[PDB]
Structure 1
Amino acid sequence: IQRTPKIQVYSRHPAENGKSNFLNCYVSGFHPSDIEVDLLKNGERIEKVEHSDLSFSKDWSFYLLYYTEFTPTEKDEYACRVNHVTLSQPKIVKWDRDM
């Protein structure tokens, strides 16, 4: 069966403008495993983005964590863009600073 990814975007620590943090995009619950994830700053792909090793949960569905060191600022918007065979177009999830 195909399963579309859940996409959760959050920072490592509660955010404070001007202090370094990590931005995380956790994509989970998807099948099959091919997936493309970019982290965006003001709409543009961030270059230095790491990710965990693909693994899977008890229900066979896959999960991956993508992440990057960042310094939040009042003027900048961050987001996670995901493409997967279950999506007709890439799904963009903006970072909610509460997260």
Structure 2
Amino acid sequence: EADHVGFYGTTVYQSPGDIGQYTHEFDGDELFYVDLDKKKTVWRLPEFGQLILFEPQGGLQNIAAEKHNLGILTKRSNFTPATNEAPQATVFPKSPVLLGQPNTLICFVDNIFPPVINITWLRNSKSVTDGVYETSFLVNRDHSFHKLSYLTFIPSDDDIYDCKVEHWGLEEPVLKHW
């Protein structure tokens, strides 16, 4: 066919916090992630989780393998820590903006290292949550990550929006207005 690349086995782990993640993607799209604290596979496309199965244990093994490897590498590196990077976000509609017409607003945050972020939406300058969704930390070739959030809205009113990006290789949260 065409070029296709599968991302099968992707594991992340961070030390203070024992925070980890495991995912699978195809052509840059997230197939599913495995809920670790509750040990279950969460398909981004439900219809997909009904035709194909992935036992969580698999993901769970790699997380352990990495917990293991982190402790070993951290030492080997004589404890060099992660140097911080500043993310860049982008807000845009998933569909043609029509007056009164329900839409979903998307915020694209890239250059995320580490996989620690608080991306937050607000017309106000204080939050509003319904239709607020998030993807897992998507992997980048340069070993940085990127995350997307959504907002479900219909356009006339209060119309000012903002995607607040809090990350410490960073300062103003990043208020990206739309």
SS of the residue aligned with 2:104?
strand
**Aligned residue in 2 for 1:40:** 122
Deviates more, 1:41-50 or 1:80-89: 41-50
User: Which amino acid in the other structure matches residue 20 of structure 1?
Assistant: P
Instruction: Tell whether 2:119 aligns with 1:50.
Output: no
**Aligned residue in 1 for 2:93:** 11
Paired residues for 1:57-68 under 5 Å: 57-68=140-151
Backbone CA RMSD of aligned residues: 1.4
TM-score (normalizing by structure 1): 0.86
Aligned length: 95
Structure (1 or 2) with the larger CA radius of gyration: 2
SS of the residue aligned with 1:44?
coil
**Aligned residue in 2 for 1:85:** 168
> Does the CA contact (< 8 Å) of 2:91 and 2:177 recur in 1?
yes
| Larger strand percent | 1
Query: Highest relative contact order (Cα 8 Å, sep 6+), 1 or 2?
Result: 1
User: Which amino acid in the other structure matches residue 17 of structure 1?
Assistant: L
Q: Deviations over 1:6-55 (max 9, x none)?
A: 10000111212200010111111121111101111233312121101112
> Does the CA contact (< 8 Å) of 1:2 and 1:31 recur in 2?
yes
Post-superposition offset of 1:75: 4.3
| Larger helix percent | 2
Structure 1 unaligned regions, length at least 5: none
Structure 2 unaligned regions, length at least 5: 1-82
Q: Deviations over 1:41-87 (max 9, x none)?
A: 23331212110111211100011110021111154211100100112
> Does the CA contact (< 8 Å) of 2:123 and 2:158 recur in 1?
no
> Does the CA contact (< 8 Å) of 1:42 and 1:76 recur in 2?
no
